[PDB]
Amino acid sequence: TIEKRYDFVFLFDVQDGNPNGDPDAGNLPRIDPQTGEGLVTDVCLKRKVRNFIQMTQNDEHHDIFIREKGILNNLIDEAHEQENVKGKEKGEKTEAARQYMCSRYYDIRTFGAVMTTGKNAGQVRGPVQLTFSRSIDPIMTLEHSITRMAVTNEKDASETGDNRTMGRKFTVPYGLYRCHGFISTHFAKQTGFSENDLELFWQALVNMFDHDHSAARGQMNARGLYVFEHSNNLGDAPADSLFKRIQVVKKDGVEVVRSFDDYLVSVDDKNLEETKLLRKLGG
Amino acid sequence: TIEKRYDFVFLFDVQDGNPNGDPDAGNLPRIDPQTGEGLVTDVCLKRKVRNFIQMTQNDEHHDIFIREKGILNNLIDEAHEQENVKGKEKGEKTEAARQYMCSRYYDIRTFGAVMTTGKNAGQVRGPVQLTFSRSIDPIMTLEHSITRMAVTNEKDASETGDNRTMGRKFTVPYGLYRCHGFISTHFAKQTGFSENDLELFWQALVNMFDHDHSAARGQMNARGLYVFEHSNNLGDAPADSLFKRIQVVKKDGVEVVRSFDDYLVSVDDKNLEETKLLRKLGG
Amino acid sequence: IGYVLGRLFAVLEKIQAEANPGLNATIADRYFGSASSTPIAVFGTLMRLLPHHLNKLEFEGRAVQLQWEIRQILEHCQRFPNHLNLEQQGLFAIGYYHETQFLFTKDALKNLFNEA
Amino acid sequence: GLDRNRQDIGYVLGRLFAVLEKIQAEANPGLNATIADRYFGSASSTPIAVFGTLMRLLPHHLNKLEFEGRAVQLQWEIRQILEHCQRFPNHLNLEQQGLFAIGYYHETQFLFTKDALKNLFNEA
Amino acid sequence: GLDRNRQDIGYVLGRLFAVLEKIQAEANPGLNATIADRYFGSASSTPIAVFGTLMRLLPHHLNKLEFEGRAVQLQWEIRQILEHCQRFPNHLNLEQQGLFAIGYYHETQFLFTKDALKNLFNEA
Amino acid sequence: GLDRNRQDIGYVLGRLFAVLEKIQAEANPGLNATIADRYFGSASSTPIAVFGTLMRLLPHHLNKLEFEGRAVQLQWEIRQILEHCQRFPNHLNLEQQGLFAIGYYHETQFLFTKDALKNLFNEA
RNA sequence: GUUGAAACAGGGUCAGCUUGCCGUAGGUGGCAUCGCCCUCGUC
DNA sequence: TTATATTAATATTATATTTA
């Protein structure tokens, strides 16, 4: 497990694409409406970190609690087919199952997982908690209407031969989403989330967009990962008094941004060294 | 499947024509609003690739999800008439159909396909992921009003002494669109997108504009295809730090661009030689 | 500002379901979760789908009628709100069902249109 | 239900697009793809994209208007709208995103309310 | 709703085209194809194309103006506009693309507001 | 709004034509067809065509100027303009095409701004 | 001043734990600004 | 479950700055 508590600011941008479509809103990117600023669910970045770990690790102790044919109760019931089939006395059977699901699944060891579901595998909080990613500036979701020269089931096929299903491609012409995240040590103790799993997570945060590309994402990058590693298991400083050190603003004279070169990411590591490290992992 | 993660800057210009008709929400060349920079949807270039492969391969294992007569669920329910007729147990039946139409459709191997439509046949992540091609400099769309010596409909307004239907031919006087694209080996594992499929894709990006010509789009060319072949399945370096290598600017004193000779495509392969191969395929 | 946007969503989805009879993702199934609770997130984009849906209505007069009533609906709307209070997402739902059973009334839209 | 003096750039552009399509749909009422059907998607989001071309395209509709005074009627309210539009915004704000649709349908109502434009013009 | 000192080349050219068509439409009010109907499409996009020819064409409209002082009225505001136009831009920027239509209708309003030009001229 | 040192041959010729017509319209203010009305069309496009004849025609206007010092006033700025005109271009470039109209109306403003020419002359 | 009195809802308890909106799709295909018009009549 | 056909549509404004 980790013995420091981390608070990271993960600035990641989208250049021409849908960082996180709101299923509630067609697929147009999640947006803080009353401020227009974009949003990328914590589960979205946790997903791309999951995809990254499923991509790179390819080994047990770093599984992902996983992709489509991922009936989660199947994995959970795999936990109950272990050393704790009977020997763990239903009360703490779920706790031994938690320890397992944490051992095997880096998803569970790192983020949590609601695995109370099948042969109940407990309820892991997850040391790593990304927040929602609110873009620094209002994403100007472009909603590029596109075309397809093909249709789907011959019920929407044209009354003439000209099949087409134009459809819509929402893109953020640029948004520098800013995801605050918290590696909580107290729950790293619960899941066994180690500094190895944490370095995996930092690699995952930096490289989670180089690999999770879509026609939807267009181009997303990890514009910076400033990790505040506290000395204590506790917090040396309040988390937001740290996150205000990573002040990301649109630069001097940009009406609204179109690239990371339109944002100044001023990092204020001036006095945090009270007892505490700031490591600029990503930027 | 491919084993090296390609990230390519695909610069393509339009000498005088409508690069990507336009938003369909409008039809003047797809622009980025703020910058006025033209956009060409990733799906537009993907269609140029699709048309190139469709004309070139004319082959099984390279079909396309074709043009007008392109009811996609026809081609998907065709996938449920193979070795996986039904014996593939709906869970993995969709995966077997997905593998079948990866193998069969170069389209799907190369670019994904939302095949979860007919007899649901999985979704393909599309190893090759072009992004929205955005022109280096604001495309100065000319919007040439043209005429027709012939009215289309025998409407009320097909009047006595002349049948004319003025109409408008939007055209980019010149614009060097830049298409960052990403070829992910992890998602080429899921389609069988092969090194030969990828050589076909490069041949497509280079030669696909010489074949998809039109009155609307005018003359449009592949001005550069600078691929970065990462040494490994993962990212040898963050994609954008590689796309910054292919820095495209207007030349010294050209206020406005008229041709590729108005664009310094500065390319520095200085330190990518670490483990990247800058394969300048297209220029 | 919640009820009239519920009506707006009802007419929008009626127009879509009138344009595409068999839809797999009506703008309900696709935009409702955020048109009910977050109208600027959606109704700024539902109503770009709207001209196309009206275009696709096989009876262009029906398109005119439905566009007329969405004009009437939206005349009560001065701005899509950033977020709909819990009070009004109930209105949105009530407004949605009110307007959608108004549209699926015998001649209600044809009548209301004809008295203008 | 039309704030003719709203000054909300989304709302004034929606009004402007409503009158633009009113003119197009009075220029030739039998029209396959009105500018709602072909331009609205970006007029609501990228007003600079179309609204330039929408007004290449506007004087020709004003010509095609059969009732030559009706052209003055509609052009006058285009000007009334455009007093409130100091610039076609590059990208319509999200508030303004929705207010464009608001404006389209508010001004479309104002145009299809019987005497409103012909009246309101005569008080100018 | 007219920023007479906007300096936005699109907006000043729109104003200039508005007064140019005002003169043409006061030169001969009965006019099949005003310069809006024949020139606006490029005046809004390619000001060098027309605006040269628009001012071959302008002194002749100023002559055809029945009220010889009205010609001075309108020529004066052409000059007022053209102080803000250091050059007819080759291609109007997209911002300027839209601002040309803005200028056309802003200045057209300013011309069709009753006393505005005759007043504003008399403060010069 | 006048770049007296622009050196853009279209702009300096526009300025030159503006002062030429200023002199003609001060020579005899009651004038049916000023050189704008008869020469501008080519002065803006074919400066060699007219601008030769415009200056056959110029000293006679300077004579007809009632205020004999006003003739010096205007001739001086003709010379100020023509320092920037190394040659009347055969055909005005298209950029220069538009800049001629720019110059006409810039210099026309400069002449019809009250004290400008009489002042600016007195700093020479 | 002989006649319903007195009277607690208390004390307190994270709704949590977490979950890609997705995979992706040409705006197309194309359309003459045209047909034509003394700068004149003359000093 | 139902329902499923076109509203509105006729002119704003319009008279000279500068000139030692």
Side-chain angles (χ1 to χ4, degrees):
Chain A
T1 74
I2 60 192
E3 306 305 329
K4 316 277 183 290
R5 164 187 169 261
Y6 303 72
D7 309 294
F8 60 90
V9 191
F10 176 51
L11 301 157
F12 68 94
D13 63 4
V14 61
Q15 285 194 4
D16 283 320
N18 201 339
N20 192 243
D22 208 356
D24 277 352
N27 192 33
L28 61 84
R30 299 199 199 269
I31 67 171
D32 201 314
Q34 69 275 17
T35 189
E37 278 170 9
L39 289 155
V40 168
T41 43
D42 50 47
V43 299
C44 191
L45 310 183
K46 290 163 173 222
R47 177 76 244 166
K48 300 176 173 60
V49 168
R50 282 164 168 116
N51 297 3
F52 188 80
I53 296 304
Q54 179 148 61
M55 185 180 289
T56 71
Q57 289 321 114
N58 296 115
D59 69 270
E60 187 260 326
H61 278 42
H62 298 286
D63 285 300
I64 300 299
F65 183 76
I66 58 181
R67 164 77 265 177
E68 45 180 9
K69 301 292 108 168
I71 308 164
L72 297 178
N73 288 5
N74 294 12
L75 295 81
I76 288 165
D77 299 8
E78 293 179 354
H80 286 223
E81 312 316 291
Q82 285 300 139
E83 52 84 16
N84 67 352
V85 295
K86 174 217 316 183
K88 287 307 273 181
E89 182 65 26
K90 61 93 177 178
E92 76 273 14
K93 184 193 280 190
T94 65
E95 190 277 331
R98 294 179 66 251
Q99 300 308 326
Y100 176 82
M101 316 290 296
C102 292
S103 287
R104 262 207 81 211
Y105 306 162
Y106 174 96
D107 175 358
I108 289 164
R109 198 193 308 108
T110 290
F111 323 106
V114 178
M115 65 184 73
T116 76
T117 63
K119 295 209 193 78
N120 198 297
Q123 178 179 178
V124 171
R125 173 180 281 205
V128 179
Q129 304 302 332
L130 286 88
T131 61
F132 270 53
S133 305
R134 187 161 290 97
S135 74
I136 307 299
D137 281 339
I139 64 160
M140 295 296 172
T141 284
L142 276 188
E143 313 179 41
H144 286 298
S145 186
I146 60 174
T147 314
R148 186 169 55 180
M149 64 183 72
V151 294
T152 61
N153 45 354
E154 188 191 356
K155 167 261 296 176
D156 291 331
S158 299
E159 77 273 1
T160 77
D162 291 331
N163 300 317
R164 46 192 79 247
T165 61
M166 293 177 70
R168 182 65 60 85
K169 177 96 75 192
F170 315 98
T171 76
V172 174
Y174 187 76
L176 179 54
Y177 290 81
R178 169 191 174 86
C179 181
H180 295 308
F182 309 98
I183 322 298
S184 54
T185 289
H186 169 235
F187 310 100
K189 302 190 305 182
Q190 311 287 329
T191 78
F193 175 86
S194 58
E195 297 89 350
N196 194 6
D197 312 301
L198 184 63
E199 284 297 334
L200 259 63
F201 182 62
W202 299 142
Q203 298 186 13
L205 275 192
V206 179
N207 311 317
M208 59 164 314
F209 296 108
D210 300 330
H211 298 98
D212 193 302
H213 282 301
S214 301
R217 275 69 173 174
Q219 203 205 335
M220 294 177 71
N221 317 274
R223 294 313 189 175
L225 179 55
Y226 313 96
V227 167
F228 297 105
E229 169 198 3
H230 303 257
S231 66
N232 289 316
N233 298 47
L234 289 73
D236 308 346
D240 192 276
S241 84
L242 303 173
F243 295 166
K244 300 290 94 176
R245 301 173 162 286
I246 320 299
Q247 56 258 13
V248 186
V249 292
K250 56 153 58 174
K251 292 182 181 179
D252 313 330
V254 286
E255 48 174 1
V256 72
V257 298
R258 270 306 181 273
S259 65
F260 191 51
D261 292 331
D262 282 20
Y263 286 100
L264 180 58
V265 173
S266 288
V267 173
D268 178 30
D269 50 356
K270 271 298 293 152
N271 290 318
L272 55 82
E273 309 91 311
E274 165 191 338
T275 60
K276 168 170 166 296
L277 282 72
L278 170 53
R279 50 201 209 181
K280 322 212 179 156
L281 285 173
Chain B
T1 74
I2 62 170
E3 74 268 8
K4 291 178 104 154
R5 192 180 93 76
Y6 302 82
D7 292 333
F8 61 93
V9 171
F10 170 55
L11 301 173
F12 70 96
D13 68 17
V14 62
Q15 281 78 15
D16 203 326
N18 180 349
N20 188 359
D22 299 315
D24 315 314
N27 194 2
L28 73 164
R30 209 181 276 269
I31 61 170
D32 192 353
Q34 295 298 110
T35 58
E37 284 160 24
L39 280 151
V40 163
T41 49
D42 47 56
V43 308
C44 171
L45 298 203
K46 282 154 176 218
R47 192 63 216 168
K48 311 281 187 297
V49 175
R50 280 148 202 246
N51 299 350
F52 184 81
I53 303 299
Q54 184 178 2
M55 65 179 288
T56 297
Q57 297 325 114
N58 270 321
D59 177 22
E60 61 86 20
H61 298 323
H62 289 277
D63 297 325
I64 294 298
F65 284 174
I66 44 165
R67 205 199 210 184
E68 296 177 354
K69 275 79 173 174
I71 307 160
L72 290 194
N73 295 8
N74 283 11
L75 307 162
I76 289 159
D77 307 339
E78 184 183 0
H80 292 218
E81 307 170 0
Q82 273 72 15
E83 48 85 21
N84 65 293
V85 162
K86 197 184 157 51
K88 275 309 284 176
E89 199 55 36
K90 56 93 182 176
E92 57 271 10
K93 174 188 194 187
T94 62
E95 170 58 28
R98 193 175 71 93
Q99 295 298 289
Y100 168 81
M101 292 183 286
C102 292
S103 71
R104 186 178 199 259
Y105 298 72
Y106 176 84
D107 186 297
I108 298 168
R109 278 178 299 173
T110 307
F111 314 108
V114 179
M115 294 182 286
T116 66
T117 64
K119 296 171 188 171
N120 176 311
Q123 65 183 358
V124 159
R125 185 45 165 278
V128 176
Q129 290 301 60
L130 290 87
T131 60
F132 270 61
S133 299
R134 46 173 53 257
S135 50
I136 300 314
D137 192 66
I139 55 151
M140 295 299 291
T141 289
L142 269 179
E143 290 155 47
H144 283 117
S145 189
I146 60 175
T147 82
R148 208 190 329 134
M149 294 177 71
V151 62
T152 294
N153 214 348
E154 57 274 36
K155 53 176 80 70
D156 55 286
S158 305
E159 182 65 26
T160 62
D162 206 357
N163 286 330
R164 293 182 183 272
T165 300
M166 185 65 73
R168 198 162 284 264
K169 210 162 198 172
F170 312 85
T171 182
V172 170
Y174 185 81
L176 182 62
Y177 293 91
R178 178 168 185 188
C179 194
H180 309 275
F182 314 84
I183 306 190
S184 49
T185 76
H186 164 235
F187 300 123
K189 301 171 184 176
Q190 293 179 356
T191 80
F193 177 80
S194 298
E195 289 290 334
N196 182 51
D197 283 327
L198 177 135
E199 279 313 318
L200 287 202
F201 176 63
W202 300 140
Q203 184 178 2
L205 293 176
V206 176
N207 311 292
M208 66 182 180
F209 291 127
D210 309 346
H211 302 74
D212 190 312
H213 282 296
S214 165
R217 69 181 66 252
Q219 182 183 5
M220 182 178 71
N221 289 138
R223 285 331 210 173
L225 169 68
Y226 314 87
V227 182
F228 304 97
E229 172 181 37
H230 300 172
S231 57
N232 54 20
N233 291 318
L234 282 71
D236 273 359
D240 200 79
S241 73
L242 268 61
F243 295 160
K244 292 181 181 179
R245 311 301 195 86
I246 319 304
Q247 64 183 357
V248 193
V249 290
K250 293 187 286 185
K251 271 218 200 299
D252 49 2
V254 294
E255 52 174 358
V256 293
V257 297
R258 299 292 84 187
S259 59
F260 196 49
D261 304 349
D262 283 356
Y263 272 119
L264 294 174
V265 179
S266 176
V267 169
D268 49 336
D269 45 352
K270 300 289 94 176
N271 283 57
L272 61 83
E273 279 145 12
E274 202 88 26
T275 49
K276 278 74 69 177
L277 258 66
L278 176 43
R279 333 178 67 193
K280 306 181 179 69
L281 283 77
Chain C
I1 204 63
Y3 182 88
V4 299
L5 282 72
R7 304 177 50 199
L8 190 85
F9 198 89
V11 57
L12 278 166
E13 181 187 359
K14 177 68 211 308
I15 292 166
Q16 208 194 15
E18 190 70 33
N20 290 317
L23 272 189
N24 172 270
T26 61
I27 60 164
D29 307 350
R30 201 150 54 82
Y31 285 97
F32 181 93
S34 193
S36 169
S37 53
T38 302
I40 57 156
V42 162
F43 280 115
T45 80
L46 278 189
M47 294 177 71
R48 275 85 65 82
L49 291 177
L50 170 62
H52 321 310
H53 301 334
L54 300 168
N55 195 14
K56 188 173 173 65
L57 296 181
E58 60 93 19
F59 278 157
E60 192 56 36
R62 178 62 169 171
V64 160
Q65 287 182 176
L66 279 159
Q67 194 177 26
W68 169 89
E69 75 165 354
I70 191 166
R71 284 160 33 211
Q72 308 296 141
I73 283 172
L74 192 64
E75 151 179 10
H76 311 314
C77 182
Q78 281 311 315
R79 64 173 291 271
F80 302 132
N82 308 300
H83 186 258
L84 266 192
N85 197 353
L86 206 79
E87 320 187 339
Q88 276 87 20
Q89 319 177 22
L91 276 190
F92 184 99
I94 281 154
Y96 177 85
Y97 191 84
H98 272 167
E99 184 89 26
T100 193
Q101 294 299 135
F102 163 88
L103 293 179
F104 287 110
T105 315
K106 174 58 188 69
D107 282 13
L109 183 50
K110 184 176 47 184
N111 294 334
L112 271 296
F113 174 74
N114 288 340
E115 287 102 16
Chain D
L2 167 66
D3 213 23
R4 297 197 53 79
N5 22 42
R6 182 76 177 271
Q7 290 291 12
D8 285 330
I9 192 64
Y11 191 15
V12 340
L13 291 179
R15 294 179 58 229
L16 168 69
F17 190 90
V19 61
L20 280 178
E21 182 184 2
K22 189 71 202 302
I23 298 160
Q24 198 195 19
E26 299 185 50
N28 54 355
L31 196 60
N32 188 0
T34 63
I35 59 170
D37 307 315
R38 144 191 25 234
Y39 279 177
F40 193 112
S42 58
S44 178
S45 63
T46 305
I48 60 164
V50 291
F51 271 120
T53 77
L54 275 177
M55 295 179 206
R56 278 73 165 177
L57 187 64
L58 169 60
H60 321 305
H61 298 124
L62 299 182
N63 255 39
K64 193 170 176 61
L65 294 174
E66 186 65 27
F67 295 113
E68 184 177 1
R70 178 64 176 152
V72 178
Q73 296 295 344
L74 298 146
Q75 198 169 24
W76 165 84
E77 53 163 354
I78 295 168
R79 308 175 306 145
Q80 298 308 95
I81 290 157
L82 285 181
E83 297 143 26
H84 306 234
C85 183
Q86 291 307 316
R87 57 177 298 277
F88 292 146
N90 272 339
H91 192 303
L92 265 187
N93 182 277
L94 183 63
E95 182 103 18
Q96 295 347 332
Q97 263 330 128
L99 272 132
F100 182 101
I102 298 300
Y104 181 75
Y105 283 116
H106 279 229
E107 185 87 28
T108 305
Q109 180 69 1
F110 163 77
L111 297 182
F112 289 95
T113 61
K114 185 179 307 179
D115 209 4
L117 181 60
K118 185 175 64 66
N119 282 337
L120 184 93
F121 175 77
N122 287 282
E123 291 84 4
Chain E
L2 168 66
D3 213 23
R4 297 197 53 79
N5 22 42
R6 182 76 177 271
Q7 290 291 11
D8 286 330
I9 192 64
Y11 191 14
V12 340
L13 291 179
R15 294 179 58 229
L16 168 69
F17 190 90
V19 61
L20 280 178
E21 182 184 2
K22 190 71 202 302
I23 298 160
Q24 198 195 19
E26 299 185 50
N28 54 355
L31 196 60
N32 188 0
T34 63
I35 59 170
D37 307 315
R38 144 190 25 234
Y39 279 177
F40 193 112
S42 58
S44 178
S45 63
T46 305
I48 60 164
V50 291
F51 271 120
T53 77
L54 275 177
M55 295 179 206
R56 278 73 165 177
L57 187 64
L58 169 60
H60 321 305
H61 298 124
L62 299 182
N63 255 39
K64 193 170 176 61
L65 294 174
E66 186 65 26
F67 295 113
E68 184 177 1
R70 178 64 176 152
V72 178
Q73 296 295 344
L74 298 146
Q75 198 169 24
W76 165 84
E77 53 163 354
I78 295 168
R79 308 175 306 145
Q80 298 308 95
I81 290 157
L82 285 181
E83 297 143 26
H84 306 234
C85 183
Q86 291 307 316
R87 57 177 298 277
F88 292 146
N90 272 339
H91 192 303
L92 265 187
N93 182 277
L94 183 63
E95 182 103 18
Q96 295 347 332
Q97 263 330 128
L99 272 132
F100 182 101
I102 298 300
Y104 181 75
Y105 283 116
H106 279 230
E107 185 87 28
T108 305
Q109 180 69 1
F110 163 77
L111 297 182
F112 289 95
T113 61
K114 185 179 307 179
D115 209 4
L117 181 60
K118 185 175 64 66
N119 282 337
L120 184 93
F121 175 77
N122 287 282
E123 291 84 4
Chain F
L2 167 66
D3 213 23
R4 297 197 53 79
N5 22 42
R6 182 76 177 271
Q7 290 291 11
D8 285 330
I9 192 64
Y11 191 14
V12 340
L13 291 179
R15 294 179 58 229
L16 168 69
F17 190 90
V19 61
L20 280 178
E21 182 184 2
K22 189 71 202 302
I23 298 160
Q24 198 195 19
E26 299 185 50
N28 54 355
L31 196 60
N32 188 180
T34 63
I35 59 170
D37 307 315
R38 144 191 25 234
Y39 279 177
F40 193 112
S42 58
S44 178
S45 63
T46 305
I48 60 164
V50 291
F51 271 120
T53 77
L54 275 177
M55 295 179 206
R56 278 73 165 177
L57 187 65
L58 169 60
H60 321 305
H61 298 124
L62 299 182
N63 255 39
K64 193 170 176 61
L65 294 174
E66 186 65 26
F67 295 113
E68 184 177 1
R70 178 64 176 152
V72 178
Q73 296 295 344
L74 298 146
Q75 198 169 24
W76 165 84
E77 53 163 354
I78 295 168
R79 308 175 306 145
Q80 298 308 95
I81 290 157
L82 285 181
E83 297 143 26
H84 306 234
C85 183
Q86 291 307 316
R87 57 177 298 277
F88 292 146
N90 272 339
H91 192 303
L92 265 187
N93 182 277
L94 183 63
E95 182 103 18
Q96 295 347 332
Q97 263 330 128
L99 272 132
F100 182 101
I102 298 300
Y104 181 75
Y105 283 116
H106 279 229
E107 185 87 28
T108 305
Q109 180 69 1
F110 163 78
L111 297 182
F112 289 95
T113 61
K114 185 179 307 179
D115 209 4
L117 181 60
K118 185 175 64 66
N119 282 337
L120 184 93
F121 175 77
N122 287 281
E123 291 84 4

